[PDB]
Amino acid sequence: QRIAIEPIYDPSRSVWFDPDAKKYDKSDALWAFCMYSLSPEKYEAEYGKKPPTSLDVTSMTSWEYNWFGADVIYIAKYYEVRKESVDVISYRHPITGEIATYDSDQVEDIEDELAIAGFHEVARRSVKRRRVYVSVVDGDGFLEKPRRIPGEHIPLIPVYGKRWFIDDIERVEGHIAKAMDPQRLYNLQVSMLADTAAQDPG
Amino acid sequence: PAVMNQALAALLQQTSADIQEVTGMNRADMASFIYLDNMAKSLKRAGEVWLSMAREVYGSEREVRQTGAVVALNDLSVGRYDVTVDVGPSYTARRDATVSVLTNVLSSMLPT
Amino acid sequence: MAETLEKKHERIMLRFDRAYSPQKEVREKCIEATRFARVPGGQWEGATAAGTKLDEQFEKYPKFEINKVATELNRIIAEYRNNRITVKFRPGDREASEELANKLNGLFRADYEETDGGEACDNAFDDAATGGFGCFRLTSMLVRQRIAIEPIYDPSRSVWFDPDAKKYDKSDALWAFCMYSLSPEKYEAEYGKKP
Amino acid sequence: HIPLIPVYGKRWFIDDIERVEGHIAKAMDPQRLYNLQVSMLADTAAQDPGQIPIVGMEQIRGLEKHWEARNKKRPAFLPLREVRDKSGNIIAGATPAGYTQPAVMNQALAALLQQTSADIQEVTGMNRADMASFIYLDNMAKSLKRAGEVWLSMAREVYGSEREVRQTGAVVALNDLSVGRYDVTVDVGPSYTARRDATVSVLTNVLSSMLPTDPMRPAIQGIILDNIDGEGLDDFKEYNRNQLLISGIAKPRNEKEQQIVQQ
Amino acid sequence: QIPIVGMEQIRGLEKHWEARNKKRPAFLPLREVRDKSGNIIAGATPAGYTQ
Amino acid sequence: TKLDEQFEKYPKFEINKVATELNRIIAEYRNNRITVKFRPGDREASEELAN
């Protein structure tokens, strides 16, 4: 097993968080979405034959843009955080030290050594923990049923240029938003001068 | 012939000058400081998430050298580790990290 | 007259209005300033949709925005983010005060690092330098007990003090309010079904 | 104490009312007047770009195609008629009557552009005191001092009193009382991620103000190198500590060196 | 600046002067100033401009 | 505009001058990339753990 770091493409129209999270790093969030586009053939590869797909909708893109591709199929990943109750069933084995042992519920089922050198002793303490589940959904139903991922936090890491919290809404800014008006006014000035010059040469 | 009215010339100069004005102690004077500072506090959160995720994949560390699990196990009630998440320069190999700090220790020393 | 008996609640509500009224025009300027400097179209707010008929139409006046007041503010904020400063706990003249100071400002560092201290301080300074008022909170969370440092968002329209406190740090205050917004579903989560 | 810690940019108490100010309130009027100046200049410039000749209808009838293509073809001349009154007499020549005017950029607008652009930089901003960020950074320190006082008052009820007869606190959960105010003072200083940074930062300031002489300087360097350091420095650090403790500066921590290398 | 003209000097030709900045006219038409007897007293140029 | 029963379009020249500073900022980061550190603590075994 391994931990991997992967990139996310088009974050502006792909990542959506709980509207109740206010911190920079979104620590206090309880769910999130991560959308990505897909081709009909790759949707046929996994997820089986299936109906002809029901993609998600945002009504965001093609806003001043040309469309030619019907290879849309938008799929999303869904992250949940739940409390749940898990039984710690410690094999606190007296020998070779081993005081205050772990034995979470998900250990014994996979770890079947037939209890070589552990003993069982106190194993009847139930504790509320915190786990994270992941799922794959579309506009119709579940492409992949929920399963728990190995951690405690939502594994999405946001990066901002400049971020502020103004009126119940988080606001960001890059490095070119402030220069739109002078640039697109300079362009108009040059374009208007060119043809006026070209109209009456001599 | 054509004339190139005065208002257009004034607008050309004004807009061309304003584009540079709007867009941009040694470090803080540069226009790229805030972005490079907000990147560090994102990497700090990434480190925290990695630490929380690594215990269940590689197992707890514990001491009595640094020895982990046997086949696949976590250990619990071992407590928070004694490390602090920070940021620093990115190095391809460990040797670069060693020589980079040792050469900074040097060059601040009189020959003696 | 208390708890279930809401006779305490009318007093609380009256105190809210008494605290809100004096500091009402002051906070409007702070909010307007932050919005003027940060929101993309906020420099023209108040006019926005203004124009003339122009032969039975409603063409609106062009409203270009060339933001030139934010550069010095960014310089000031970068100045602080370069050198962040924190609490020190200097010792005294005694046999054991050295170890006492060491222990105390190690505990404080532990509390500041393992919670949202850095975010709280950065947010407070940013708001204070932009509008003029910032704030942050100091609570005690259960993890087997701990002191935690937390940020406060939108201090201008969220924090209201006793109108009888006059000092910089509001030491001589006897009550205060801290508002925050919430979603209907999260209101259903805790606080029960409720009205 | 109430656990809320206010932070102000600039604060004054004027008429029974507390008044605050940031760094952009003073510059709103010049900025939003500059915006209006630019917006008003743009469309005035865009209204009348060039010049067009003006003629009478019967002075050019039948000759429009020659004037239409005067920039593509290369005519040797352009024909036109004269202006005749109702009885057939000539009163004006064959030249066009006049031309339209292009945009002008009145002088008051130019003066306002320059003045407002200059005023924005004037209103908004011994070495430290000359900078425009000093007052904000000074008001932050006195907020942090109050935060320290609140934390120290609240920490006694959570971690217990200290006492000394080392610093050992409670047993299960207790406060102790009538132990009195502590012997510390709240201040501000640079913020460090780890303790090692704090140690090396002050030790290197103690150094670099010392002439190369006296035992001191090697001891300071040894103490500095004992802290700090990262990956792959095990052997170097052990070699350093050996020389640091055989010279009576390290105080063996009663495990192996007091009986092996110290002896 | 706005040109100043007489009412009878431009009647029936407003659509050409309205669109002089969008379309690219080869010229602009205008009439002369005539007195009560029908004699010409002024040319086809506008009388003046505002300041 | 129509322009005598056609649809000639306005010329729209584009002179991109806003990307130079953005490229400078990006080059600044790509020259110095920075990553996670994992500083040690004050304990007998924290050094090896951090390594």
Side-chain angles (χ1 to χ4, degrees), chain A residues 161-193:
Chain A
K162 287 171 284 188
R163 169 201 188 268
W164 312 282
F165 196 97
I166 298 293
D167 268 355
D168 314 308
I169 293 299
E170 155 183 75
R171 305 181 184 273
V172 309
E173 186 200 288
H175 196 71
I176 62 170
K178 287 198 289 187
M180 317 207 75
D181 268 356
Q183 168 73 84
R184 74 162 77 239
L185 192 60
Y186 177 79
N187 284 340
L188 174 64
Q189 295 316 303
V190 169
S191 313
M192 276 210 294
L193 180 61

Side-chain angles (χ1 to χ4, degrees), chain D residues 17 29 62 69-70 84 98 106 121 127 146 154-156 160-161 170 199 202 206 250 261:
Chain D
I17 292 299
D29 267 355
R70 66 202 198 237
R84 279 165 209 272
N106 55 306
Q121 313 176 240
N127 288 13
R146 163 82 171 159
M154 157 194 294
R156 291 169 62 96
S161 78
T199 310
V202 65
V206 162
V261 58

Side-chain angles (χ1 to χ4, degrees), chain C residues 7-49:
Chain C
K7 277 73 69 177
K8 269 190 63 68
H9 201 258
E10 293 83 4
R11 292 198 293 112
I12 283 161
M13 296 285 111
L14 284 175
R15 282 181 171 180
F16 188 93
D17 298 87
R18 288 206 295 109
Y20 171 78
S21 175
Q23 290 287 124
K24 156 77 162 59
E25 297 85 355
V26 175
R27 313 269 187 114
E28 268 173 25
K29 293 296 290 190
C30 304
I31 296 169
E32 171 199 357
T34 59
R35 176 168 282 276
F36 184 85
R38 299 298 192 210
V39 167
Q43 308 217 313
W44 280 95
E45 284 182 0
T48 314

Side-chain angles (χ1 to χ4, degrees), chain D residues 23-164 166-257:
Chain D
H23 198 72
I24 62 170
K26 284 198 288 187
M28 284 192 252
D29 267 355
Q31 164 74 82
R32 75 161 77 239
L33 192 60
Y34 178 80
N35 289 342
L36 172 66
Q37 293 318 304
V38 168
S39 313
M40 276 211 295
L41 180 60
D43 55 358
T44 296
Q47 200 161 1
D48 295 333
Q51 282 181 339
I52 299 105
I54 306 171
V55 294
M57 307 173 282
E58 88 168 2
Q59 200 178 2
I60 206 165
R61 179 62 63 92
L63 312 168
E64 292 102 1
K65 49 183 192 45
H66 297 294
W67 287 73
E68 180 189 4
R70 66 202 198 237
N71 69 293
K72 307 175 184 59
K73 292 170 165 48
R74 306 178 72 198
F77 51 92
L78 282 180
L80 214 55
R81 288 159 193 147
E82 295 86 337
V83 177
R84 279 165 209 272
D85 65 340
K86 83 203 181 182
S87 63
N89 300 312
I90 295 179
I91 63 170
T95 175
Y99 290 77
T100 74
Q101 301 295 113
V104 72
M105 182 179 72
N106 55 306
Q107 181 180 16
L109 189 150
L112 271 167
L113 275 180
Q114 294 178 1
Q115 204 55 68
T116 53
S117 179
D119 285 328
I120 289 170
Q121 313 176 240
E122 270 186 71
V123 166
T124 72
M126 314 204 207
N127 288 13
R128 294 179 66 188
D130 273 325
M131 294 177 71
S133 65
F134 184 69
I135 186 65
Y136 308 95
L137 282 155
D138 191 83
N139 278 350
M140 187 87 198
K142 67 197 296 194
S143 295
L144 285 160
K145 291 183 176 68
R146 163 82 171 159
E149 178 194 53
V150 178
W151 183 94
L152 193 58
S153 169
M154 157 194 294
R156 291 169 62 96
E157 216 169 313
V158 166
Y159 305 132
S161 78
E162 297 296 327
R163 182 65 60 84
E164 157 57 22
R166 81 284 190 279
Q167 299 297 289
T168 48
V171 286
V172 63
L174 62 83
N175 189 330
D176 192 327
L177 189 150
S178 81
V179 68
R181 184 194 296 266
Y182 284 155
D183 206 8
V184 302
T185 310
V186 185
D187 202 2
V188 296
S191 181
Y192 297 123
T193 306
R195 177 208 66 75
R196 306 165 174 279
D197 289 340
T199 310
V200 299
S201 171
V202 65
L203 275 180
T204 198
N205 281 337
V206 162
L207 201 68
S208 83
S209 73
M210 294 177 70
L211 277 296
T213 312
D214 202 75
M216 295 298 102
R217 187 178 175 88
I220 312 285
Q221 283 186 357
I223 301 296
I224 286 172
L225 297 188
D226 181 69
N227 297 272
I228 192 167
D229 300 303
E231 286 190 275
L233 281 72
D234 291 331
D235 296 1
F236 163 65
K237 285 187 75 166
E238 185 176 1
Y239 163 73
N240 189 359
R241 180 157 181 77
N242 279 345
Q243 293 200 341
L244 206 54
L245 61 83
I246 66 170
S247 178
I249 318 170
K251 299 289 94 176
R253 50 185 76 175
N254 290 273
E255 79 282 31
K256 63 179 288 293
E257 56 263 17

